[PDB]
Amino acid sequence: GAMLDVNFFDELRIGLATAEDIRQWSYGEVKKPETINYRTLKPEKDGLFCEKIFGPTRDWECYCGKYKRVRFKGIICERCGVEVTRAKVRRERMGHIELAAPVTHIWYFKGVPSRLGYLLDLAPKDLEKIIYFAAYVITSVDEEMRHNELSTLEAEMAVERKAVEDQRDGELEARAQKLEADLAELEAEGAKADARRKVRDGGEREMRQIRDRAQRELDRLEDIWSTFTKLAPKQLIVDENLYRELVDRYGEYFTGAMGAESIQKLIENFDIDAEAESLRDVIRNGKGQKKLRALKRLKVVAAFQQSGNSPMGMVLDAVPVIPPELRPMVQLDGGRFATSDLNDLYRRVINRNNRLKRLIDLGAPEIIVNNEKRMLQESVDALFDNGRRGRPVTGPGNRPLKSLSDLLKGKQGRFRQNLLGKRVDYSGRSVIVVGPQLKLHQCGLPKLMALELFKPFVMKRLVDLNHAQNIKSAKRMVERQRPQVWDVLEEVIAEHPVLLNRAPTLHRLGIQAFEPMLVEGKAIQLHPLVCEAFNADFDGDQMAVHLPLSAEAQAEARILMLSSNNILSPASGRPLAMPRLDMVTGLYYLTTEVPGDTGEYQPASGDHPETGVYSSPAEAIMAADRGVLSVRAKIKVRLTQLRPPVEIEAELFGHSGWQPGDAWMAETTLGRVMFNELLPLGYPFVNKQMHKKVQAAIINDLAERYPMIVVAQTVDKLKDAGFYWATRSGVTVSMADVLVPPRKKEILDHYEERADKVEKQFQRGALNHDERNEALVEIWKEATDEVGQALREHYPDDNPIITIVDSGATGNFTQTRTLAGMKGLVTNPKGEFIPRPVKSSFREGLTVLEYFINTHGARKGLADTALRTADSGYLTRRLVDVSQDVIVREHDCQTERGIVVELAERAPDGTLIRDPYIETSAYARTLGTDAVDEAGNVIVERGQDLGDPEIDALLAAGITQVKVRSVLTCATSTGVCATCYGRSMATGKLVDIGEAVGIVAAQSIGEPGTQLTMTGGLPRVQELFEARVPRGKAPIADVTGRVRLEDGERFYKITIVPDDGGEEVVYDKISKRQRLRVFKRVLSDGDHVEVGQQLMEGSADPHEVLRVQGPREVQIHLVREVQEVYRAQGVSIHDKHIEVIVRQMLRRVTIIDSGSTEFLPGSLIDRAEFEAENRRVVAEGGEPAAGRPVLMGITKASLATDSWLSAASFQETTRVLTDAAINCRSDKLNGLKENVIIGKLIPAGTGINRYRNIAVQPTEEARAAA
Amino acid sequence: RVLRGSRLGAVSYETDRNHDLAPRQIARYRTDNGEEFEVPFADDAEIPGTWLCRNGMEGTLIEGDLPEPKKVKPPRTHWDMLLERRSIEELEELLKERLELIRSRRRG
Amino acid sequence: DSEAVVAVDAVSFTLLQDQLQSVLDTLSEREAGVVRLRFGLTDGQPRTLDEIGQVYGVTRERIRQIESKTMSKLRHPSRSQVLRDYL
DNA sequence: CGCCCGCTTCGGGGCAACCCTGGTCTAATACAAATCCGGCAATGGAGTCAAGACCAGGTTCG
DNA sequence: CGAACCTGGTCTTGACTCCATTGCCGGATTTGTATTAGACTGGCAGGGTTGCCCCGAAGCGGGCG
Ligand SMILES: [Mg+2]
Ligand SMILES: [Zn+2]
Ligand SMILES: [Zn+2]
């Protein structure tokens, strides 16, 4: 493995760095806390910027300035000591700090669990008392000497205890003689007898003090002797005076130290294999939490045993220095220097090490030396991670110093920021405006901006032409803007696509590519049909513009991300370039038919003829240009260049719908004729009224039948005709054009009488306050609906306010109801309903209290919108971070395992009634089973696309259940295959073999979450992927049988009689907010239940319904429930975008048995890898691990990946990494997340090896052509 | 408006010729713990026999060129600090008084 | 970063080097060798007229006469407008 | 039939990431080494001046 | 044709000069170190927020007499 940076690794092995490797990397021990000399501003000698250590700051310049040119290269100036090279190796070369006393890394010490204490089986507080110098610890004891000497030492211990006994005997005899003297001098002299007894009591206190004091001396003697017996390594010796009296008394027989040197010695005399086999035996034969604790220790013990690492590097002997350009000291205007906050930590460590070395070479009391070592230890710990232990080291303003771990963890860390994305050159941004004359593959561009974008291209072109004799003349021509430069700009712009980009990119259509064209002004003219995809209205929104440079990048933007190539959804395959408001209203006015219009065909032929027929639509056009024909009048033209609809064509001639040579009549409008002139010749006639749904169906049929270029040109022509008839439609808004219903006031009068009766009923006290609130809520909701019905019948259709909605351009009817009629009921700030309705329309003008009532709901809606777009960003973050490693990798996994789809379950009258969610579930999938009708004709073969006509065919055949293939059962391992993914929604053809459908699925799920209108809503969706427990946890059955339905006290107690041999399953906490599930009729007692039928109607948990109904149904439970939410908002998400995620969740099963090959209880490992090890272990020791499939949540399944580099961008990056270097887990760079970070060609789409390695060379016929 | 900075160093822009260089000697250096180090000096260059190597210590030249051994002096001792204020006979009388003190400790 | 690569002047410098090589190609062999070894453009070492006469077998005063000839030859604006542009 | 015992289970609690309800100090002195720098004062090679001598082939004349 | 001349480079010598190149000494300034004798001998930014896991007290069914 070479670090010479040749841009191919395919491997990245993190691991612990030894002290030998640290001193191997460096270029000399930095040994002074001097950064930059205050006067000369040159780096100091042997300090934190020393050019001899790291390198020169001036290019190929030695420090003294003797050698100064590139001829002197690769050498070192003998005077100044700086190797001559470039300045950018100062970014590269590390230095190290040698240490006088050893050091423990805080990343193995302050962890959960502390890996030091788990390797040495010690408490965390043991370590905080050892390497903070609060306790002693022995590392060895010569028991081979200690027993055969311990005989004689017991003899000497008994001798010395006899000596303390002789001392207390002589002391008590002296006190006995003193007490005898006190008695003999008290008896013969007359005083108070109590004073003599108290003199005896003082002597007695003295002799009891002597006897228990020398008793405790003897106790301390036998205590230090017993400690010498119980003298062993890994023993903590607190209070250290026992230690000091144990050093001199037989000091040779043990080795007790304190600190990092003691930890290093303990790791030194540590056969890891001994405790490895001991822990093997304990996890084999043990019981309880001692077994699981030995498992948790055995994890890291076998981790250290497995790789070629050693725990010697857990202590630290030399500390490396990050190269000084990464911690620069730049001065500013006025000489304002700017440090980088690591230099202070490095200065503190350097100073403390120098002081410690000085005190060690001097000779000092050990309190001072150990205190300096503790200060050094805290300094190193804060240098790696400030605030990991104790109080964080801060500076001026008490702001904490951004230490080394702070450059990795957190939002400002290297991983998150490098994942966040960088600013780019050849870019730019502007505000946008509409481009209603541009073609679809086109965007306007201001010449003042596109001149700034294409400056190198325009310089090269106008220096190739004679307008500049070098690039400098061309550059000053660009800045001074000679008028030929616009011509040169047009030359370099022609066929050179740019990228457009709105603010936040919710999904894949948020970045498109357009051919530019120069436009006067300063705003990006943008085609109006892509604002739906961008979600960019023209209220002042700004779009950024990037630019591809390479031939590969220009080809990628030209073929892949072109505007006309992306019309259909990634989500549901519906066209997103389908027209809207102005275009839809114009086409609606153009295609509606009004009876009695001018120039109408009448069949009246008495004396006069019928006068409604036209030989040509051009003749009709002249008849409309003259003031005779209204374009919405019924006429009978004879069309010759249009395909008649299928009935008239097939009945008119022999199925050869030859619309070039057709000649046929149609009783239509002129407008629908002119409208169907936009459509292709191969398309049949339409003869309908262009509702927006009808136009959606038309463009769907066009996209699924014709090539996309015809769809693009048709959509462009539709836009132009839509605007041209949007002008002539006359849809204005007048204050007279908002009519209020004349019977509004009587409606409000009658419902006010009902409300007054309810108010009187509450005023009697006949009902509670909440119930009269509910009564008024029901009364005014019914009143508002009645007002809406009266307004619906009152309005005529030519009213432009109702015409906009009735076309389907925009808006619901409720906006018209709030315009004229009644506002209705406005919510509380809490979300309750205000009992006073707003009985005035916005046309009539509100009153002040009504406006104050409406402001609550307005403010809450805006706050909800802000929180909803933030949470949707988070949800898409989680989904992309889970599903980013599912790309199509094989053409066909070729299993037969596939799910079954319902596909239009019938009616009891005999009708195969169409299920609503066919176009989201059964569409666009490859059939795994052949379709047969009672084994009659095989109607649809295995592996059809399941588009429209085969669905109609199976509907005619009557068969419903179709076992279709899906990604829930794709037999490929590395990602999914192609046929199990089915038809791509973006193309309508089969998915190509490199399309990252995980990111497509994640974006299509996370995108429309802002339109999700909020237990149910977006948090309910968010916990659903997260595999959380639902708060409204409706219970499920566990077995069939008749229920013992019973309702207790504030919560129900519903039991179930098992139909099988089993126990009567008790369900305990069934609160009153849950209700009996009505299915099939309402639930009843003794109703025979299913295996996993839901007890109450509500939210079932996914984890137990996995544990009951197996893994198949828990996919069908997850998919349909999540899709049920997006049904409620009218959002078409095809289920295969959901099914990508659910396959990612169930990748892992749980493991309880070790079996025969190295497993742990509760270990979550991959199903296929669990399957993989078992095949190699059923032979040679056939004891497999006891496995169980488990559902794991999104934020958890993301973190339990093998690629630690991808996992580093997720959470607390220390614990992602400290185990990773312990396990020496080499990343393989195979996910596309990591190849982004190292800038490798990502393996998805163009980067994969089947496409990247294409040899391109012309045909040998073509070489003979020239 | 925009605050700018400059790391105080010179940046040129030349051709990295890996062919047309000043030719050069290589001096092998041996440190105190036998560590080898090959410092590239120039051709026209006096080679110092002593050299602070990459090791973080002083590394002498691998040949027996005999550099200067010390050329230094001891800083000071606690005895020197003692001798600046006291007499030799003063310290000898204190030595005899502590000899008599250890005599009273031992056998008196 | 005011001490970073300005990146138009570097490619300008390379193009200036190539155009200067063309301009030296437009002159004779002795002239090109004299200017190249004089200003050290071919190696990085400006030698003197005595070294050029040492490698050329002629007087250093001959090198100074060749120098004056070449600098008079260079100072045609008709020849060096393309180099007047480069400053 | 009841008395003891580890397995399990839950509350206690023990503890890892984020934030912000949250400053003025004795004062020199002695000296020695290092270092900068400043001014004459040798250059001594490197550039400059100039004279003059080598002709070589156009230019012109007989 | 034979020959004088005219001006293109081409090269030599000889003198000159001129500005770097040390070089040394004298001084200026700058940086580091030693020493300042009455007495003085144990504290400070630190708390509150969120959440996740480690572990002892307790139910509790199995083992035991
Ligand atoms: Mg907007
Ligand atoms: Zn140097
Ligand atoms: Zn498959």
Token readout for A303 is 């981790």
List residue ranges whose Cβ is under 7 angstroms from nucleic strand D.
Answer: A 110, 112, 124-125, 287-289, 388, 398, 409-410, 1212, 1214-1215; C 48-51, 60-61, 64, 67
Tell me the residue ranges of DSSP E strands in A1029-1121: 1041-1044, 1051-1056, 1065-1071, 1075-1076, 1088-1089, 1096-1097
- Taking each helix axis from N to C end, the angle separating A455-464 and A485-493, rounded to the nearest 10 degrees, works out to 110
CB atoms within 10 A of CB A559: 11
Instruction: Tell me the residue type at B75.
Output: P
Q: How far apart are the first and last CA of chain A?
A: 48
**Closest A-chain CA to B1:** A333
Backbone angles phi, psi at A667, to 5 degrees: -90, 90
Adjacent-strand bridge partners of A96: A29, A320
d(CA A373, CA A103): 9
Contacts for A743 with CB less than 8 Å, ≥ 6 apart: A790
Residues in chain C with CB shorter than 8 Å from the CB of B13 are 5, 9-10, 13
Residues in C touching A474 (Cβ below 8 Å): none
Contact B42 A332 (CB under 8 A): no
Write the DSSP symbol of residue A677: T
The answer to whether the Cα torsion of B82, B84, B89, B90 is positive or negative is: negative
Rounded distance between C-alpha atoms, residue A345 and residue A351, angstroms = 10
B18 contacts: CB under 8 Å, gap ≥ 6: none
H-helix or E-strand spanning residue A102: strand A95-104
Contact A604, A559 (CB under 8 A): no
Burial zone of A773 (CB within 10 Å; 0-12 exposed, 13-18 middle, 19+ buried)? middle
CA of residue A996 to ligand 3 center, whole Å: 15
Phi-psi label, residue B34: left if phi above 0, alpha if psi -120 to 50, beta otherwise:
left
Residue A977 marked in a binding site: yes
Give the number of whichever ligand sits closest to the CA of residue A538. 1
DSSP-based three-state secondary structure for A639: strand
Angle value at C-alpha A838, between A837 and A841, nearest 5 degrees:
145
Answer positive or negative: Cα dihedral of A145, A150, A155, A158: positive
Distance in angstroms (rounded) separating the CA atoms of residues A1237 and A1216: 16
Contact assessment for residue A372 and residue A352, using Cβ atoms and an 8 Å cutoff = yes
Residue A1130: CB atoms within 10 A of its CB come to 8
Q: Which tokens in the block code for residue A335?
A: 């000489």
Q: How many CB atoms lie within 10 A of CB A657?
A: 18
Tell me how crowded residue B92 is: count the other CB atoms within 10 A of its CB.
10
Token pair for A153: 């030492």
Burial environment of residue A18 by CB neighbours within 10 A (0 to 12, 13 to 18, 19 or more): middle
What end-to-end distance do the CA atoms of chain C give, in Å? Answer: 23
The rounded distance, in Å, linking the Cα atoms of A87 and B8 is 11
Q: Which residues of chain C does A71 touch, with a Cβ-Cβ cutoff of 8 Å?
A: 43-45
Answer whether A57 touches C (CB < 8 Å). no
Residue B17, min C-alpha distance to chain C (Å):
9
Distance from CA of C82 to the nearest CA of A (A): 6
User: Which tokens is A329 given?
Assistant: 């000291």
Q: Which of A854, A721, A745, A741 is nearest to A789 (CA)?
A: A741
Q: How far is the CA of A52 from the centre of ligand 2 (A)?
A: 9
Instruction: With beta carbons less than 8 A apart as the criterion, state whether A19 and A313 touch.
Output: yes
Helix (H, G, I), strand (E, B) or coil at A1220: helix
CA C44 to chain centre: 12
CB B13 to CB C44 under 8 A? no
Picking from B9, B41, B55, the nearest residue to A57 by CB comes out as B9
What's phi and psi for A274, nearest 5 deg? -65, -50
Question: Do A1139 and A1116 form a contact (C-beta atoms < 8 A)?
Answer: no
Strands A442-446, A511-519: pairing is parallel
- For residue B26, what is the nearest residue in chain A, using CA coordinates? A75
Contact across the interface for A69 and C44, Cβ inside 8 Å: yes
**A531 annotated to a ligand binding site:** no
Q: How many CB pairs under 8 A join A and C?
A: 26
| The one-letter amino acid at A1141 | I
| CA of A72, nearest ligand number | 2
Residue A148, exposed/middle/buried by CB under 10 A (0-12, 13-18, 19+)?
Answer: exposed
Q: Secondary structure of A584-625 in the HEC alphabet? A: HHHHHHHHCCCCCCCCCCCCCCCCCCCCCEECCHHHHHHHHH
Q: Which amino acid is at A267?
A: I
The count of other CB atoms within 10 Å of the CB of residue A486 is 15
Q: With a CB-CB cutoff of 8 Å, which residues 272-331 of chain A face chain B?
A: 325, 328-331
> How far apart (Å, rounded) are the C-alpha atoms in residues A604 and A472?
82
DSSP secondary structure string for all residues of A967-980: GGG---SSSEESTT
Q: Is the dihedral of CA A1078, A1080, A1086, A1090 positive or negative?
A: negative
- Intra-chain end-to-end CA distance of chain B, in Å: 89
Q: Is C6 on the interface with A (CB under 8 A)?
A: no
> Which contacts qualify for A1205-1212: CB closer than 8 Å, 24 or more apart?
A1205/A12, A1205/A1229, A1205/A1233, A1205/A1234, A1205/A1237, A1206/A884, A1206/A1231, A1206/A1233, A1206/A1234, A1208/A408, A1208/A415, A1209/A415, A1209/A416, A1209/A419, A1209/A881, A1209/A1233, A1209/A1237, A1210/A881, A1212/A409
CA→C1' distance for A224 and E57 (Å): 36
Q: Helix and strand tally (H, E) in chain A?
A: 41, 33
Nearest to A75 among B16, B41, B57 (CB): B41
**Residues composing chain C:** 87
Q: Say yes or no: C10 contacts chain A, CB-CB below 8 A.
A: no
Q: Report helix angle C9-25 to C77-84, nearest 10.
A: 160
Task: Flag if B13 and C5 touch (Cβ within 8 Å).
Answer: yes
- Taking ligand 1, which is a single-atom ion, which protein residues have CB atoms under 5 Å away? A 537, 539, 541
Structure tokens at A261: 């040197």
Question: In 3D, which of A497, A493, A495 has the Cα closest to residue A557?
Answer: A497
E strand or H helix that includes residue A245: helix A241-248
Strand partners, A512: A500
Q: What is the CATH number of domain A581-728?
A: 1.10.274.100
Pick from A493, A499, A491: nearest CA to A553: A499
CB-closest option in A70, A71, A470 to C86 = A470
A1014 CB near a chain B CB, below 8 Å? Answer: no
* Cα A519 to Cα A528: distance, rounded to the nearest angstrom: 16
Find all residues with CB under 8 Å of A46, minimum gap 6, and list them. A28, A30, A31, A32, A52, A53
For residue A50, say whether it is annotated as part of any ligand binding site.
no
**Are A598 and A628 contacting, i.e. CB atoms less than 8 angstroms apart?**
yes
Say how far apart CA A736 and CA A264 lie, in whole Å: 92
Q: Determine whether the annotation assigns residue A537 to a binding site.
A: yes
* Cα–Cα dist A945/B80, whole Å: 100
Judge whether A279 and A298 are in contact, CB under 8 Å. Answer: yes
Q: Say if residue A626 is exposed, middle or buried (CB neighbours under 10 Å; 0-12, 13-18, 19+).
A: exposed
Do residues A457 and A489 touch, judged by C-beta distance below 8 A?
no
The two three-digit tokens of residue A1071, written as one number: 């609160």
Find, among A1034, A1087, A1032, A1038, the residue nearest to A1058 by Cα.
Answer: A1038
Tokens 């609606």 belong to A588
Q: By C-alpha distance, which of A823, A740, A745, A730 is closest to A780?
A: A823
Report the candidate in C57, C59, C56 with the shortest Cα–Cα distance to residue C32: C56
A743-863 belongs to which homologous superfamily? RNA polymerase Rpb1 funnel domain (1.10.132.30)
Please state, in angstroms and rounded to a whole number, the distance separating the CA atoms of residues A842 and A819.
5
Q: How far is residue A947 from each of residues A68, A640, A920, A924, A937, measured CA to CA in Å? A: 75, 32, 11, 6, 20
Longest CA–CA separation in chain C, Å: 51
Residue count of chain B, please give it.
Answer: 108
Copy the structure tokens of residue C68: 């004056």
Angstrom distances, CA of residue A543 to CA of A437, A450, A526: 19, 14, 10
Quick one: DSSP state of residue A404?
S
Q: Does A470 touch chain C (CB under 8 A)?
A: yes
* Distance from the B19 Cα atom to the nearest Cα atom in chain C, whole angstroms: 10
In this complex, the residue of A71, A468, A471 whose CB is nearest that of residue C11 is: A471
Please calculate the CA angle A875-A876-A882 and round it to the nearest 5 degrees: 95
Radius of gyration in angstroms for the set of CA atoms belonging to chain B, rounded to a whole number = 29
Annotation-wise, does A798 bind a ligand?
no
Question: What is the C-alpha separation between A1220 and A1211, in angstroms, rounded?
Answer: 14
How far apart are alpha carbons A445 and A521 in whole angstroms?
A: 9
- Point out which residues pair with A1166 in neighbouring strands: A1148
**Backbone dihedral angles phi then psi of residue A587, each to the nearest 5 degrees:** -70, -30
Query: Which value, to the nearest 10 degrees, does the dihedral of the CA atoms of residues A217, A218, A223, A224 take?
Result: 70
Provide the sign of the torsion angle of the four alpha carbons A1015, A1020, A1023, A1028, taken in this order.
Answer: positive
CB contact under 8 A, B39 and A76: yes
Question: What's the gap in Å between A525 CA and the centre of ligand 1?
Answer: 15
Q: Give, as ranges, the nucleotides of chain D with any atom within 7 Å of a protein CB.
A: 6-8, 15-18, 20, 22, 45-51
Residues B56, A29: C-beta atoms closer than 8 Å: yes
Residue type, A343: N
Centre of ligand 1 to C-alpha A542, Å, is 8
How many whole angstroms separate alpha carbon A919 and alpha carbon A947?
9
Q: Would the CA dihedral through A88, A89, A90, A94 be positive or negative? A: positive
Which residue from A481, A494, A495, A484 is spatially nearest to A462, judged by alpha carbons?
A484
* Chain CA centroid to CA A582, Å: 38
3-state secondary structure of A555: helix
Cβ atoms of residues A143 and A232 within 8 Å: no
Q: How far is the CA of A1186 from the C1' of D5 (A)?
A: 29
Answer whether A581-728 and A743-863 agree in fold: no
B48 preceded by a cis bond (ω within 30 of 0): no
Against chain C, the chains showing at least 3 CB pairs within 8 Å are: A, B
Q: Do C44 and B11 touch (CB under 8 A)?
A: no
Which among A453, A422, A430 is positioned nearest to A543, based on CA atoms? A430
Strand order in the sheet with A254-257: A236-237, A136-141, A254-257
A980 belongs to an annotated ligand binding site? yes
Q: How far apart are CA A229 and CA A227, in angstroms?
A: 5
* Interatomic CA distance for residues A604 and A612, integer angstroms: 10
Reported resolution, Å? 3.7
Q: Cα dist. A160→A166, A172, A701 in Å?
A: 9, 18, 107
From CA A780, how far away is CA A999, in angstroms rounded? 47
Distance CA A744, CA A855 (A): 25
Strands A976-977 and A888-890: parallel
Return the ∠ at Cα A220 (arms to A217 and A221), rounded to 5°: 85
Beta strands in A864-957 (DSSP E): 888-890, 900-901, 931-932, 938-940
Handedness of CA A598, A599, A600, A606 (dihedral sign): positive
Alpha helix ranges (H) inside A626-743 = 646-652, 670-676, 692-705, 708-728
* Nucleotides of chain E touched by protein CB (<7 A): 9-15, 30-31, 34-35, 37, 45-46, 53-55
Way the structure was solved: cryo-EM
Name the nearest CA neighbour of A1040 among A1117, A1097, A1108. A1108
**Integer Cα distance of A928 and A1162 in angstroms:** 36
Report which residue type is found at A530: V
Ligand number nearest CA of A970 is 3
Q: A74 and B56: CB-CB below 8 Å? A: no
Nearest to A141 by CA among A220, A240, A250: A250
Alpha helices in A1150-1242 (DSSP H): 1167-1178, 1194-1199, 1204-1207, 1213-1223, 1232-1237
Closest to A1205 (Cα-Cα) out of A1184, A1177, A1228, A1182: A1228
Residue keyed to tokens 């240490």: A99
